[PDB]
Design a protein around this ligand. Structure first.
Ligand code: UPG
Ligand code: CL
Ligand code: CL
Ligand code: CL
Length: 492
């Protein structure tokens, strides 16, 4: 009878620990007769394809539904008409009627009005989608998106080519939602729902109204806010009976800031703890630090659910050091390159395999090239198949400067790999047993990390022994039954 709604701004196929944690939690809840649905707030025309890939890749349970305002309001708008209305496409065809089409590239064409002596449009055509950029006085004023043969969205641009408005279209070709965009700030302003003839001040109010419509106001319905950016949307609903929880997935302290300052999003959640049923943390240490500053009484520790990988045959014969993460400053990748430089100096056979995507790619590439590590350190992009890549790693490392819990470290340990990790707040000190399943290193100590990496690369038997203890440690600490009991207590 308990229904859960796990809230994050968006879902995609190239995401990190938070999305993994949520999808795993949904699967375990569903095995315990508790519905675990995801709610997102962003527009993706291809959301069907993302969800299919997440299910077929075994990341997402087939029973885990995703609710989303664009999907919900489109399905309602679709009921209002029987036949497709071609007014928009006719308006475009009429605009370009006089215009001659000239191919610029393989996919790009331009429309020139011979009469007016002016270029009115650019068109880019792909397999599934066609984009039109419309121009007046050599300035773009609108973009039209065709997907699967129909207009799904239009965008309006000012004279600075900044987005000032977005319009969304139903499966019958009708406008059902439009919003103003602040051109410089790129923030969402007034939002208009065409069906209800209803106006909202901003995206928070619109998304809070969506939650009011989607979730019945009963105590057997639970909102779990995972995305810290989404917390204002769950706080500002008119629900009086629904249970509301916030999960803190990461160190709340300002990144690379020793002042004791706390991040704005996490500070907002923690200051408003009294307005919700509970704040869930992943470690006792994080709960302790939060209780000290915020004097919260509804704080709870529940570890992330973990997917126990199946025991496998280790065909290990390669000295590869593995690292799988979002390429973000949090992960201390410059410290990793420093460790790699020392390890490569004493063993040229050592490869460092870095899997993931992010802003830091160009910086790390420069560091690899600068230290002549192009042979030894390789950025291999995002993998939907992390398990297979880990199986061929000798050891996995973390240079991370902060965590909520090391899910990539846990994943490696479950696949019987030894781990070497900087001892950072709300991170690996819970599950890394220094000398038994891997090594806990003083933060930013390059030499100590490098030495233990070399010790493991030079001693396969020790590596295998530490690895088996790691798998056993994770199975013992993060038994799904214990976590299910903790969640069920919160729900009652
Ligand atoms: O190419 C890649 C790169 C990453 N991942 C996955 O991304 C996740 C990484 O999670 P984690 O190591 O925990 O890092 P974050 O993405 O930073 O996770 C955040 O959210 C998690 C959920 O609570 C917390 O455990 C972390 O501490 C917190 O930083 C893992 O499941 C990886 O398998 C891939 O699948 N492929
Ligand atoms: Cl094509
Ligand atoms: Cl203007
Ligand atoms: Cl602005």
């Amino acid at each position: 009878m308990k229904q859960t709604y796990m809230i994050v701004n968006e879902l995609d196929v190239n995401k990190g620990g938070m999305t993994t944690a949520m999808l795993t939690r949904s699967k375990f809840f569903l095995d315990n007769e508790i519905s675990g649905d995801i709610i997102t707030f962003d527009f993706k025309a291809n959301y069907k394809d993302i969800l299919k890939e997440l299910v077929q890749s075994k990341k997402m349970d087939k029973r885990t539904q995703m609710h989303n305002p664009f999907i919900y309001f489109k399905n309602i708008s679709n009921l209002q008409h029987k036949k497709y209305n071609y007014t928009m496409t006719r308006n475009l065809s009429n605009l370009l009627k006089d215009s001659v089409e000239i191919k610029e590239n393989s996919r790009i064409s331009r429309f020139f009005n011979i009469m007016s002596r002016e270029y009115l449009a650019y068109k880019r055509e792909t397999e599934q989608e066609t984009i039109f950029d419309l121009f007046k006085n050599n300035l773009r004023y609108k973009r039209i998106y065709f997907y699967k043969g129909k207009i799904v969205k239009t965008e309006v641009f000012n004279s600075d080519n900044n987005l000032i408005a977005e319009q969304f279209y139903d499966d019958n070709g009708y406008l059902y939602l439009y919003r103003q965009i602040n051109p410089e700030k790129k923030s969402i302003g007034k939002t208009y729902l065409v069906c209800k003839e209803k106006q909202f001040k901003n995206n928070v109010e619109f998304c809070s109204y969506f939650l009011d419509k989607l979730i019945p106001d009963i105590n057997d319905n639970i909102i779990i806010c995972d995305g810290p950016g989404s917390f204002p949307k769950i706080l500002k609903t008119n629900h009086k009976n629904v249970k509301k929880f916030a999960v803190i997935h990461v160190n709340h302290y300002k990144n690379f800031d020793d002042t004791g300052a706390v991040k704005k999003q996490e500070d907002y959640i923690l200051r408003n703890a009294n307005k919700i049923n509970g704040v869930v943390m992943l470690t006792e240490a994080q709960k302790k630090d939060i209780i000290e500053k915020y004097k919260i009484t509804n704080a709870y520790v529940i570890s992330n659910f973990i997917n126990i990988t199946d025991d496998y045959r280790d065909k290990n014969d390669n000295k590869v050091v593995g690292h799988i993460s979002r390429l973000v400053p949090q992960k201390g990748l410059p410290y990793l390159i420093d460790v790699a430089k020392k390890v490569v100096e004493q063993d040229n056979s050592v490869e460092f395999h870095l899997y993931g995507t992010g802003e830091e790619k160009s910086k790390i590439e420069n560091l690899i090239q600068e230290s002549n590590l192009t042979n030894n350190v390789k950025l291999l992009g995002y993998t939907t198949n992390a398990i297979e890549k880990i199986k061929d790693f000798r050891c996995v490392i973390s240079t991370s400067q902060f965590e909520g819990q090391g899910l990539s470290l846990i994943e490696a340990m479950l696949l019987k790999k030894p781990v070497v990790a900087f001892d950072v707040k709300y991170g690996p000190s819970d599950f890394v047993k220094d000398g038994k399943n891997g090594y806990l290193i003083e933060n930013k100590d390059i030499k100590k990390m490098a030495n233990k990496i070399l010790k493991l690369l030079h001693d396969k038997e020790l590596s295998k022994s530490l690895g088996k203890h790691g798998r056993d440690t994770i199975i013992d600490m993060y038994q799904p039954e214990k976590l299910m009991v903790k969640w069920k207590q919160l729900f009652n």
